[PDB]
Amino acid sequence: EGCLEYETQLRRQFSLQHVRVIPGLDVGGRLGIGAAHMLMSLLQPQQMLAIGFGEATMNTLQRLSGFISSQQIRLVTLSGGVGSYMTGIGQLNAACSVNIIPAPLRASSADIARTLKNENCVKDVLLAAQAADVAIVGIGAVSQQDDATIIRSGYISQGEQLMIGRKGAVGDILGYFFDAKGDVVTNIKIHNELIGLPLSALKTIPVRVGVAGGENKAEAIAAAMKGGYINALVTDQDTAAAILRS
Amino acid sequence: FEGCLEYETQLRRQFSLQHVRVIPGLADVGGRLGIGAAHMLMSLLQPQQMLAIGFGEATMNTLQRLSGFISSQQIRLVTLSGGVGSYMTGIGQLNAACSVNIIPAPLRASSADIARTLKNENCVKDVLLAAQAADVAIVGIGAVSQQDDATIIRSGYISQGEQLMIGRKGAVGDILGYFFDAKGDVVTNIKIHNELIGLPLSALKTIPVRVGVAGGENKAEAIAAAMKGGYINALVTDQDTAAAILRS
Ligand SMILES: O=P(O)(O)OC[C@H]1O[C@H](O)[C@H](O)[C@@H]1O
Ligand SMILES: O=P(O)(O)OC[C@H]1O[C@H](O)[C@H](O)[C@@H]1O
């Protein structure tokens, strides 16, 4: 009931292409339903879907697995890491096309990241990802602190997250952190250590869906939309309220 | 006389194997090899044990047939090589509660310095160690004599030129991109070896039970060599191939 109005206002405040706002209070399971449903009406047969990692995207992929088979959707990873995509990929049948960047999410140095990005088998998948028809990503917030997936998964340290925060970052997509206005934070070393597509290349993809909730993400989700990284959103009612007031 | 039971006995004694299965020649073989290798693995793996897997058609067919058993017995899988995508037809068949540990790297780097770098990345080194600690391994065996039909060529991991020179330098086959000569010794002057990300054959031998699954007469010399080098200590093959291996 209050969902339609919040959709409308989100669509107009952030110039979005599509929005779904789910009734408030479990939330992550219900976000995956909402995002799977949006993706079912967006994707045409044999189209390509680029995927990010995290709980909300993995949930979504589970609810979409039957659509993916019967419409022959091709999947491609937006980042390295492999293992982080397996909970969502394991829920598909084995005739599904899945193209996986064969590298770590983050290299121990920027030189090594650049080396890896130039290996043929990595470079091939980076291009495929950038060419996708639709993308589905999660959004992390600095305000989650130890509960953020990117920290639980060991990809950045606590000291890094404190400094990322100090430097004015509010949230991230695929390890790429941006400030409250949506601008990528430029003096953060991790950015040049990530193997996957940068957020500037992600914007090649014409429909880019963020799925994310919890009031603690509101600032990050707003900023993601202000930066243009996502042009469609799936979120929950309380978060929507919080974004609109942010 | 002869038959499969005799061929098993002879192979077992001749190569000092721990386990052997020879399937009849007569309905198509790579599928029946997979069934036979899954049945052997089912009798060797205890619950919660760890199975190291290599890539290729025979291993991926085996894993497909083992998927129900992997699930119910909570078998943990780990990749023996990089490549990620080379393993998807196999691991794609499992359910999502399955424990699957994948080397997050290419199979082969563009240079040896780059391979050495990737082997020292934390997320790669962790999985290399997990693989070496496995209870059982399952691998395919490739033969130089397959030429353009070898999976290692068909998948683009080596060039025709490379395959030619590897043959010139005395290799007969490979396991996981590591090529050995007819006595079973790894061929030392081949640059693909230092470019591979995964475990070398010497570290594969840590795994106590090492099952090769491979058939076709053109692989006979390579399979014999693989047993002579000790890379596999158990074999699943077909009748014709067993006969050829025995006369090698
Ligand atoms: O909170 P989740 O849904 O688990 O996932 C969010 C992560 O996925 C996003 O692209 C960012 O990397 C975040 O770091
Ligand atoms: O002939 P297949 O069963 O497809 O696979 C053999 C390949 O997989 C083996 O370990 C070697 O890499 C071979 O090159």
UniProtKB/Swiss-Prot annotation, chain A:
Effect of Q144A: Moderate decrease in affinity for phospho-AI-2
GO molecular function: carbohydrate binding; cis-regulatory region sequence-specific DNA binding; identical protein binding
Outcome recorded upon mutating T149A: Decreases affinity for phospho-AI-2
Induction summary: Autorepressed. Part of the lsrRK operon, which is positively regulated by cyclic AMP-cyclic AMP receptor protein (cAMP-CRP) in the absence of glucose and negatively regulated by LsrR.
Coiled-coil portions: none
One of the GO biological process terms: response to heat
Superkingdom, taxonomy of origin: Bacteria
Record-stated family: Belongs to the SorC transcriptional regulatory family.
Free-text function comment from the UniProt entry: Transcriptional regulator that represses the expression of the lsr operon (lsrACDBFG-tam) in the absence of the quorum-sensing signaling molecule autoinducer 2 (AI-2). It also represses the expression of the lsrRK operon. Acts by binding directly to the lsrA and lsrR promoter regions. In the presence of phosphorylated autoinducer-2 (phospho-AI-2), LsrR is inactivated, leading to the transcription of the genes.
Protein name: Transcriptional regulator LsrR
Organism ancestry: Bacteria, Pseudomonadati, Pseudomonadota, Gammaproteobacteria, Enterobacterales
Gene that encodes the chain: lsrR
